[PDB]
Amino acid sequence: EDEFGYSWKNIQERYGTLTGQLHMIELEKGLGLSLAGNKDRTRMSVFIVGIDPTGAAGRDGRLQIADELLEINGQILYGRSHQNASSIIKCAPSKVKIIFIRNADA
């Protein structure tokens, strides 16, 4: 585990059954992300719709448009409005840890 209780074992146990590919990354902050989604949708509840190419996420280069955000710093993002998820991200300290899933055709 890290400070949020995150390990690859743990996150695989929680989310390993979802269709798509699970990821976890750490970034230093802002992140320069635009989010969209629907609170009540059962997949794609909060997802990335924009990445500032000059901001922390863009420079890092691992996050991609349409990536579905599950958690940041121990807080669950799905089932909540994208604005609430954006607020959580904005209020977070510099160091962030993000669990997300990517949904490729093939």
CATH number for the domain including 8?
2.30.42.10
Spatial distance between the Cα atoms of 15 and 71, rounded to a whole number of angstroms: 11
Spatial distance between the Cα atoms of 99 and 27, rounded to a whole number of angstroms: 11
Single-letter code of the amino acid located at 40: D
Q: Is 55 helix (H, G, I), strand (E, B) or coil?
A: coil
Q: Which domain holds residue 75?
A: 2-106
Spatial distance between the Cα atoms of 24 and 105, rounded to a whole number of angstroms: 20
The conformation of residue 56, written as its DSSP 8-state character, comes to: H
Count the domains in the chain. 1
The residue behind tokens 């949708």 is 41
Q: Where are the beta strands (DSSP E) in 15-84?
A: 21-28, 33-36, 47-51, 68-72, 75-76
Instruction: Name the experimental technique.
Output: X-ray
